[PDB]
Amino acid sequence: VNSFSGYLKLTDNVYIKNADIVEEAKKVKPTVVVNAANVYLKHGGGVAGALNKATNNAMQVESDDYIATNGPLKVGGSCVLSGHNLAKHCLHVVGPNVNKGEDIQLLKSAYENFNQHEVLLAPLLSAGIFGADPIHSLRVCVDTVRTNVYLAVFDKNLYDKLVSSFL
Numbered sequence: 118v119n120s121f122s123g124y125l126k127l128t129d130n131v132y133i134k135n136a137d138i139v140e141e142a143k144k145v146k147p148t149v150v151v152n153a154a155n156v157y158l159k160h161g162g163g164v165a166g167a168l169n170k171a172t173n174n175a176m177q178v179e180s181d182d183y184i185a186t187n188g189p190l191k192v193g194g195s196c197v198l199s200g201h202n203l204a205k206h207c208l209h210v211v212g213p214n215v216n217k218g219e220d221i222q223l224l225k226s227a228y229e230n231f232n233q234h235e236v237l238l239a240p241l242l243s244a245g246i247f248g249a250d251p252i253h254s255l256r257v258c259v260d261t262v263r264t265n266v267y268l269a270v271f272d273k274n275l276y277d278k279l280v281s282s283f284l
């Protein structure tokens with residue numbers, strides 16, 4: 118039993134809720150919140166800009182030190198950093214950016230990072246401002262992630278369409 122409330126069960130291990138991931142993180146304080154990161158950990162907008170804003174820019178400060186030490190992530194890759202006031206940890210995961218022509222096949226590699234964590238609160242990787250079809254992102258999540266994932270979807274119409282078109 119965990120504290121995730123009001124989720125609609127999609128599969129054995131995948132659950133979904135109409136919620137802003139930022140507000141959901143503040144309420145639940147999960148062990149792991151996933152950020153929809155880019156390779157430079159520049160948290161300007163989307164999930165990343167919103168999470169970072171909720172940390173009062175502490176996520177960005179930490180991220181800049183990470184990049185100065187380690188260099189950029191790979192598309193499809195991830196790193197674990199602090200969750201600040203939102204979660205114990207933040208798993209920064211880089212899905213491909215379709216607007217920049219990045220390989221959509223890398224979306225599966227991106228979701229594989231979730232399997233290193235038993236339970237996660239997460240957005241739909243590569244969706245939103247990253248340019249991919251959210252219905253496809255949900256499908257890849259279900260067919261790749263084996264650990265327990267709680268997906269927060271910001272947009273109500275999108276949440277409704279994601280649920281309705283699933284089985």
Ligand SMILES: CCCN1C[C@@H](CNc2ncnc3[nH]c4cc(F)ccc4c23)CC1=O
Nearest residue numbers: 137138163164167240244245269270271272
């Ligand atoms: C029109 C479609 C909106 N999108 C794009 C996809 C990813 N975005 C997010 N996913 C979950 N929580 C979120 N909080 C946010 C706060 C923000 F300022 C900006 C973005 C998000 C966000 C799912 C979704 O609903």
Ligand SMILES: [Cl-]
Nearest residue numbers: 163164245246
């Ligand atoms: Cl977004």
